[PDB]
Amino acid sequence: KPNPLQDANLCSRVFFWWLNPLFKIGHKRRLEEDDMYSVLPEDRSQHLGEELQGFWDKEVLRAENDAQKPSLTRAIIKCYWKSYLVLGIFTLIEESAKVIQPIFLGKIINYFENYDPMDSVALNTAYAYATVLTFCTLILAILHHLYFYHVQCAGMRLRVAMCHMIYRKALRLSNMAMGKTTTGQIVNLLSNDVNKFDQVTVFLHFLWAGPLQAIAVTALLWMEIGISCLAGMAVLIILLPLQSCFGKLFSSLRSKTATFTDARIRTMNEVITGIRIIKMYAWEKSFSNLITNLRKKEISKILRSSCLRGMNLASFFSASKIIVFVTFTTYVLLGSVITASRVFVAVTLYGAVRLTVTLFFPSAIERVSEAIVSIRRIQTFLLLDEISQRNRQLPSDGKKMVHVQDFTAFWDKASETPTLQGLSFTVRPGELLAVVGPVGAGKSSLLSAVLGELAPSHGLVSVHGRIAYVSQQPWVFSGTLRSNILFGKKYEKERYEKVIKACALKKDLQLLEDGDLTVIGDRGTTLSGGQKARVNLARAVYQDADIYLLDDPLSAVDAEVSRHLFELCICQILHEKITILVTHQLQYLKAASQILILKDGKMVQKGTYTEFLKSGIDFGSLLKKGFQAYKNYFRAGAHWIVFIFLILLNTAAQVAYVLQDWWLSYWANKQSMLNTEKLDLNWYLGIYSGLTVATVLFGIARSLLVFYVLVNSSQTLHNKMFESILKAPVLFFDRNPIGRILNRFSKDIGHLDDLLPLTFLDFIQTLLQVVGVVSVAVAVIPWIAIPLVPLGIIFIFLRRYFLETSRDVKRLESTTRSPVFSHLSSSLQGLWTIRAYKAEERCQELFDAHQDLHSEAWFLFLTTSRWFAVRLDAICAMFVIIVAFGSLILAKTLDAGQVGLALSYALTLMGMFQWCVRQSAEVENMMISVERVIEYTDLEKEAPWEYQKRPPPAWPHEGVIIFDNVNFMYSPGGPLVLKHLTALIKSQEKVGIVGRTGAGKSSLISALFRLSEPEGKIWIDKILTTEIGLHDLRKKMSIIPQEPVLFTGTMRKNLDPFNEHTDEELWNALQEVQLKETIEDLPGKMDTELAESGSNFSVGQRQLVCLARAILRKNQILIIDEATANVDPRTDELIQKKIREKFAHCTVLTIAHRLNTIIDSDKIMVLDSGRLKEYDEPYVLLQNKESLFYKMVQQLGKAEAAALTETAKQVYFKRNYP
Template sequence: MTSKSSPLAHAGCLSRLFLCWLSPLLQLGKKQRLEESDMYNVLEEDRSETLGKELQSFWDREVRKSKKQLSEPSLTKVLFQCYGASYAKAGLFAFSLEAIKVIQPLLLGKIILFFENYDPNDDQSLWLACTYAAAISLSTFGLTFLQHLYYYNSQRIGMKMRVAVCHMIFKKALQLSTESVGRTTTGQIVNLLSNDVNRFDEITLNLHYLWIGPLQAAVILALLWYEIGLSCLAGVTIVALMLPLQTWFGKLFGLFRSKSVIFTDNRIRIMNEVVSGIRIIKMYAWEKPFSALLTGVRKKEIHQIMKSSYLRGLNMASFFASSKIIVFFTFTVYALLGNAITASSVFVTVSLYGTIKLTVTLFFPLAVEKVSETRVSIFRIRNYLLLDEVERNDVVLALEDKEIPVELHDMSLDAPSLQSVSITVKPQQLLAVIGPVGAGKDADIYLLDDPLSAVDAEVGKFLFDQGSQIYNLMPSSVTHQLQYLKGADHIIVLNGDLGHIVAQGTYQGLTGSGFDMVSLLNSDEELWPRTVEELQTNLLQELEPQTRLEPTNTNPTAHRSCSKTAAYILQDWWLVYW
């Protein structure tokens, strides 16, 4: 993460409207290639944690409300409650943008009409023409200005929705119960995070045209009626005939999307299983059968994607062909009705039809298509969020009680076998529990179960040093990494067979009382013996403290304990050596 704060956080109204806060970054990009360190920090309001908690609160409220009303919770309703107000403001930019597109053809018609009826002595008409030209210039600037604002705000809202939903999905994955884990797959979760959430970025760009499109079409129809009269109905009829076709296309897009995601989930699930079991597959030479299985699933997925692609091609073809067909039929009817075709009427009509064509045959159908696909994604995400979670009994100590120690008295368990274990853990104290495998270290009396075993010595030392700064949480560490015992405030040594505490105290206290802790510790550079002679020497050193602590114990159980300890040491040395 960079340390550069975003200038958007302190940008004024004009800077936000004209996007001036981006100028320093653009100037830097002009001089040199941008690096990661040149990027600004994410605003606090755009962070995943902030967005996720906000949407989660709305979702939890909706779930509780639906339980009371015995109904299904609606994720769509939650999204509108959380982002509806800000998205409505972005709709004002879209409305102003389309309003300018309607006004521009009228201004163009007035200018052309001035040249058709040009009079050198008519100064008033000249000033009006200049005013219309200035208005067209300003409206063109306004189009660019409003379009950037609309796309910026819409995409930012879509980004917030996507990030917030990803936060909820990831959080849900950490809380799924055992039954819920069996009802979902890793492939489905990956598909939700990689494909389904992307629909929010797409739907926010087109959703407003579901109401802007019909409204703009009604206004343009009135203007066309005023401009060319009854002839406009010919073109409007073709546009009206295309609307149900585009709506049908949108429903088909949703249908194909719902089918393709099933094959995608199945393919990802199978691929994850293949990668996980690739050694077994290679061992038994099952490459070809599994390759054929994946190829078959992929073909089914591609078949659904190809259907969507063909349908999208027909949709785009109808868009490009519609404008020519509409103009042809309109002016054919206009000429047959005995009207004279003029430049002003042609330019105004073609411009108005061009505007309605973009809205009604492109943006409106695209909005219908994205709504259909987004509904499928929202339905899948909602079903995932409704999966059962594990019941958590979190115990949180109040800040005023942080000085109270945690005490366990005479605790006994069957498996692992702990017998009469009593410990006391004070705040800001690091407790280390050591002992052979099977001694009962993995009971629910610790917070950290050998977290250093999966990393190398250097990383482990860093984690131990940094982790020591969280003592207010009363950390306890169960570990085989004996080199860290010197840093522990209290050490507990468990016996493997008897299941009770052999010795406990500080490192200095145990070594001073005769308990040979030196033999249990190795240097950071040499954690394991490399030769049989070193192994024998260290083995005798590790067995010697038990002999000194229990000199009268000569029963067979003690010998079995020594044999087990020797076996474990040999096994660990063999695995590490190879």
Template sequence: MERLWKKNMAANEKKSKKASLLHVIIKMFFWQFMMYGILTFIVSCVFRVIQPLLLAKVIQYFDVNSTITKTEAYLYAGSLVASTFISSMLYSHTNFGVISISTRIRVACCSLMYRKILRLSKTATGHTTTGQVVNLLSNDVSRFDKVLIFLHYVWIMPFQTVLLTYFIWQFVGISALVGVGALFLQTVPVQGYLGKLTSKLRLKVALRTDERVRLMSEIISGIQVIKMYAWEKPFEKMVALARKHEIDVVKQASYLRGVYFSAMVFSERMTLFLTLLSYVLLGNHITPEKVFSLAQFYNIMQLTMAIFYPQAIQFAAEAKVSIKRLEDFLSLEETVAVTERTGHSKMGITISGVSASWEDNSITDTLSQINLNVQPDQLCVVIGPVGAGKSSLLQAILKELPLSKGTITASSEVSYASQEPWLFVGTVRQNILFGQPYNPKRYNEVVKVCALKRDFELFPNGDKTVVGERGVSLSGGQRARINLARAVYRESDVYLLDDPLSAVDTHVGKHLFEECITSYLRGKARILVTHQLQHIKYADHIVILNNGLIEVQGTYNELTASNINFAALLNSEPAEENTEKATLQNLSRQTSHMSRQTSHDSTQSIVDEENEDNEPDENTELLTTGSMKMSLYAKYFKMGGGACLLLMLVLSLIIGQSASSGSDYWVTFWTNQEQLRKHHANLNTLEDQPMNVLAWNTTPFPGAKNTELDNSSGINVYNTLTNMSSVPLPGDNQDAISPLSIFFFKVCMNASIGLHDTMFRSILQGTMRFFDTNPSGRVLNRFSKDMGAIDELLPILMLEVIQIFLVMSGILTMVSIVNYMLIIPMLCVAPLYYKIRSIYLCTAQDIKRLEGVTRSPVFSHVSASFSGLTTIRASGAQEMLRKEFDSHQDLHTSAWYLTIAATIAFGFWLDCISNVFVGCITLSFLVFEEGMLGADVGLAISQSLILSGMLQYGIRQTAEVVNQMTAVERVLEYTKIDKEQGINSESDPPVLRDLNFVIEPAQKVGIVGRTGAGKSSLISALFRLAKLEGSIKIDQVDTQTVRLHDLRSRISIIPQEPVLFSASLRDNLDPFRNYQDDTLWNALEEVELKDSVESLSHKVNAGGTNFSAGQRQLVCLARAIVRNSKVLVLDEATANVDPQTDTLIQGTIRRKFADCTVLTIAHRLNTVMDSDKVLVMDAGTMVEFGHPYELLQNQGGYFYSMVQETGKSTAEQLYQIAQQAYAQDVSIEDSDKKQESQKQS
């Protein structure tokens, strides 16, 4: 398909047309599809059409004036039964073949989409989302499964209609035109119009589902931040609004289906009524062979014209919309290979006159006139302020950023470590190797130089420990080092490292720079983007970027010798001794000291949040087994409106079916009267001569003297019963009356809304453990595929099943009334039906569950690939991931194929039993023929023929309802997940152990330690994101006694990885709308973002991709300023920003949060040296706690060692900062004691 798609694109590009996916599908599958179309034509126009003709001959045999011999009658009856057997065999075979083709189309389209994903440009990824892609892969491609089953009837319907009209004409003459014309007008024009409406609604549903799933994807990705900010309510409202917009259109589509079903039921009855009415009004008399043959002809015509053809139109309209959406996605911009690969390793990187922009119509370039030459053995360090274009420079080298001018020439192999670590679900080793062959020597060297050896020793399964999606089971530093190790392990000529040192502490950062970047990668061309200015003196070449321009470049000595005052820029990182900052420190320290009060913190243990995925099976989705319980249906309908609403619905349906069956019985009675009248007239007998009938024929009819029934009376009663078969009900406020089907869809929509809302609320209240152990693709699967089935598939299947079984009950009742002896074959086949159904359901339910479970890895793989495209392409891992995707999809297709095969086999065996039942009934009338009336025979055989096709379809649809109810089951599973108030993880080893310390009010406390020491886990304990033993008390109040929302809403955090959501800037700052615009503008001004945005309605892309990493962090700081909480947590908040932005953030925090308690997790020690206290952690325990200056007096201590590892000059500067801060504290304390002494004296 990919080859044909590219060929189609090229051909249409020459004609300035859009490529057509439909043409590609037709070219691939047309002839296979048409082969099954021919078989469908034979079934529809031969074997089904001859059945009413054969039925007429069998009924005619029972006419007293019949010339048909018994041998001929047996021949006709045998042919009738044989035609049903042949029809069933061919129908099952063609269905299986067509569904197999639709499966191949679906698989091909999914594979084509995934290959497109791997080629999407960075600009294109900004125009789509993971949620939209998941929706295309789950809902849109599934349209092929439906449309192909019915599509052949679009061209078969005209042939069959002409043929049936001819035979009906032979029976009733010109009256045939009345019935056929009425059926045509009720179906084709009406269904054509409904098809157009369906197409429009389908597009609306798809777009609104995209929006909801996109929003859900963002929420799942940023759930930790949402919980810490206590933003569950605003996001619940956002999802509720998106869901309301979606469900409004889904309701319209469902009600449209309700109109369709009402028209279907009405047309089936009305067509026969109008034909008989016109036939009688023209002065003719009805006969059994004519009435029941007409009923069969119209049943066949109505099946094709009013059911199969409209469904073909409807599903074709939906498929057309889906194909259009797939085409739009497949037409998105791809990466363009503008970087020249030299094929040898001595070239390095040469950038000549490069200008580039992310947007085609951008006024300013992201990069402008870049000229840079990096030799094969050089280390080039790129520095610059936030938003300078540093990452964009690397993206240009990687071919991700299209060039508008200039050229880039690079060596043959390039390796890349992204700024935000990208990890996928797999072991740590798999993440490092990433498709490369395992070389033990090189692997161990890379592990050592990336400082991962100790981490592997702490992991329960070493490097075979399973990493959760996005590395959620690891600390930020561990993720960064594994991400770096992947790039380093790959044997390349050029290494592009985008700020890999920002997420690690000073000691580890120094190790990575010296052992890995400068030593292990010596002899390679390296470009390092960093904000760690202490390292640049060791670089061979330094580039300073600002606003997309190279302000200056050269060696360290050249830059220090220039007039740009580079030394000041360098020293601002560790020392930060400017006057303004010193003034702010003094103000902060005085205010902090004056407002201190006592507070106590005693934390003994906390659940190991950093090692949730220790066991490889943590991420395996649980597979439910066993039969579907009736309580599941009860829960579904309870959400739909309760018992009263359901009881009303059932009673109304029973009344409607009773009227429908009554009309069939009345036609039989009326026809019998006509036959008796004709018979007595021919015999010219006495009026009171009794009829000789067998006692076992229980159809009531008057005696000879009452055999005449007035035609007008017959028509009037028939008309009344026909109209009653579509009983209207009082509708809602929008409609005066609504048909039963619309009423039923309303119940289903209520259930769907309830299930979605309950599941979403449960997800929002779920523990972080749930999100750490469940990939986003798995969760999105419930909100996309499963909710799609509940919204659209389940209601229509349930309605079909209810209507079919009501009709079946009516048929069995009618057959029993005609001849109670026919109850015997019914009792024989009923256990067989039940046994086969039980065997099938036992298997089908588990297969369907297996299909659902094997579907989740496909979505998870797509989601992970979509978020790591740059790393994937830089590593050349596209082929490996394509094979992995194909493997996931093959596994899912295997389960899907089993579902199809089991369903078709089930239907076939049901058909066989039904055909045996038809044979028993038909032949029984010939064996026991004496005294039988033609109308009774016609009713029994025609109803059993309907039953033959309907029963297998009904039971199969019942099984399909049970299968689709697994979606309800899976959704309800997520309503029972552990809630935060009841976190249950007792078996997990604690990551924090025996922590005991006190932080006084308004103190500024730094928390330091090696990556993986438990710093972030301590913050999780503060926010109650995990279970803890002991207590954390704020102002003598145990946090475990406070409502989660109240606790979190009173603590502000600036997280390690800034999270922004696709909404307005205002909603990102204040989703509750609690603050005035002036407050928000003041906060933006404090962080120097006021001039960077046009208004508070400024659109923020998903993940904040239209902001740089530093700007995203500033927005998070603005959030904290707006909230103005008394406790502020900074989780390595300045790790990804340049020194100037770091200075801005630190200064703003000291100024705006002088009266607040501030906890700072930091890797850069300069940010905590002036703190009131420093908490030093190692392996989850507190090893030191005190003032930085006091800790530095212990030369054998952890903190002293960490400071010394920064280098001699930096260590001296850090010591001076701590000493000055300590002296200031002592001076303030002495002044306070002196004032207190004076007061006492």
């Protein structure tokens, strides 16, 4: 894919003309991967990583020569000082523009001060300064973007080289170094830790330019305004520790918030995961209270953090006002007059140095601090202990064989028990060696030593021949599946086919929809254990090496294909190869001509299968061991009258912001139109400070009120969201995954709470300063409006033209990054499989590809943004040229102050308009969080919780149930699960239920609880389910789910989350379940805060807690849905005892797979495809032995079946005829 940057001239490189052909492709349609350009030859992953590795190897060699800790920063700085110093050269010619440009504004406004129509030479020099002003604005606005691309490109090159190294080392890490760390500690080295090199370079030249820019700003400020500058510079300095104090206090508040926020999100994951449970038990009032209090405590901290961010972002807005008010509060109280040229040179210089000192210098320090942290962490990673490179193959004498002698080594040196103990064996060509030994003998470290992956501690190994390693764990990575099959080797179609069809993969390749060349899903998500096992086996067959170390490869396959390959392929093709094979399976011990047996690193015996059998020693014994969004968003927070007040406060903040500068302008005008006469200093500076304090107060009020209204929008949208998802029918959770909904509560509501209010107030603030600039120009030179409406339209269309591609680039920048981390993650898993093959050469190349492709995406991300920024800055430069020249062609009308105000604002337009547009896009893609949230507030609610027509307070009293033609179905328009269901349940009746789960067992329960309103008619004690409030039905019903769910918090919550009862009944219930000792032996007997879902509890204990809950409820109807499905037999029968003793007076519905559960049945509901076909007493149903009940009973065995039938008859006669 040719890269127009490769062969584009300087003009079409500074203007990114070379990138237009891409926009004309994105405007029409969506950009896919194949449409991205290719990365320059000097940006490939290899070239960069190899240069940096050469420098870093040189530096570690030099340091070890000096015997001092080797520095990685030195390797970097040596590798990237040539490029990143010429970058600094343009940094100088750019910040010197930023600093000199004001000194040209000064000489424009100075011609305006002494304007004389006749002196056309002064006019021409004013045009000269305007032209050089445009020159500065253009080397700042047009040429800044090639420079900024190149700075971000230095950062990209550093990141890519560092990723290449990190990957190479990760490949060469030794188990001693690897097992210490975790694959995550590495993948985060690439994900979040090397991504610190994309940004360090961005401002890494403000380390010496922020200081140097500030010194030159201060020096010019001296030469203009005497000491007066020091006051503004003092406030500007304070913004450094002041912004740092904001940062520290807001980080404290953010972490204190995060505690509450993650408590809320954990409670949310629990309520969503077990939402079915909560609805059934009718507790969502409790969890509603719990999360209402959690969110009130979190919103207190969010509102405090937002108030502080409001006072911060109002201090960035008012910053220049306080900085130029302390500056001319000092400059006028010292006998010096105010002049528009000096004022607006000073305001422009303060804008420059304020951006520099509070946003570019603090950013530079922060990011180089994180970059040094990252460099040191990668340093430690790259100094970790490596494997000893394959003991250099002595040019073989044709001897394909391996001998290990008395090898003893450790997982870790500290262990007194070595992995192996003086083990010696030699394998020569053609020998079929089956390795046998109990688990834990050191299989991993065993073959690691055989591979040479385990450094010697005792013994010695001679290795001559190629090796293919299959680990017990199969391994398959992210990439072309043919990359796995060839494992990076050259393609042989015929032998490829033989390898593929040898494992009978025709079946598996039919299991693949995309055939045998499928691009494997991310990190192998498309394969199971057996599938990856077969992939590994095929890879092994492919290489045809001289050695075959297999660690129980057949554990994932059945005997059929394993025997096929073993006798036809392994014992015929691979037996000629030196096979060292582990095997748990007896079926292939038959085929081991040579067997070698070990026990816990001890040499049991070596010999043939025949000898091992003849010795009398058993194998088993040795082995066995859009615009509705914005409207509905601003409405959810405040009453539209408060939005009118918000608009008025925004406008007044901005009007006072612009009017302090207009007051300096009027001040210059009324000092010029004078003289001896002094200005009314008290009056003029009083109004000046009035406007300044009005601007600061309105900035703070605007920020605080915008944050308050939008955080209140988040709080009200969250309340509606949660009150709608508690009342959202179970269907809305079946159609959606637990993770999708909870994402809307963590990520989306974090945007609405934390970032979207801030991003949106920053957008409004920068937009209103943009409009202040535009309107000052349009109000001093009204004719400017005529150029605007082209620019506006152009801008608008440009912004339409751009955002089409730069949303398909920002999507390619992100959809191609994940492979970079995925290849690392996968290679880390099968690093032993890799290094068994000399393959650090090729897998390095696949990672080089992945990194190159993501660097193509990042190259387009870097360059489309610079294209758009070049054109936005050309818009702003046209603005500056028409306010700079358009003013001088109008100098008869305008006086000094007017031009000062207008142009000083135009110069600020530069960059501030770009931030306006960035923030507009940020809002417009963060308002998808708002749209994706308001999607939930408006959501179909299930029946009301409380109707006005209520049953008697203690209803039901008899526990009678009436089913009449009740049909149920997961969702309207879907398949039915209950079919013409009709049945009576008398008071205190015991009715078992048999059927398939979801074929009518659970659906009938859901209909009973009205999870989804069913067809037909359900009465209880002459009262219908559907016409009564959902709680008034569910609360008075008690149920035990298939899986009993515990909720984090106190045992009292799990027992009585309303605290409507006393501790006496709680302990009665806990004694009934005989967990009384289990809890009283805990520090918090009634306040025992359990682990996550009681993760320190057994399934039986959680089931017993649910039993205690049901006992406490004392409802007249009990429901059990396969509660006896995942319980131990002993506590199972104990629970049966408790249920049959306590709930005797209540009607009981039992849904069980164990038939002991139903011997007490008064009736049994047999469901065939959801139809209640047999409805009688159990033994009566057994009398018709053609009954399905009889079939299922016999399916457990005729002995137990006959015993159960006799017991059923006995209980039948015992009840009916005592």
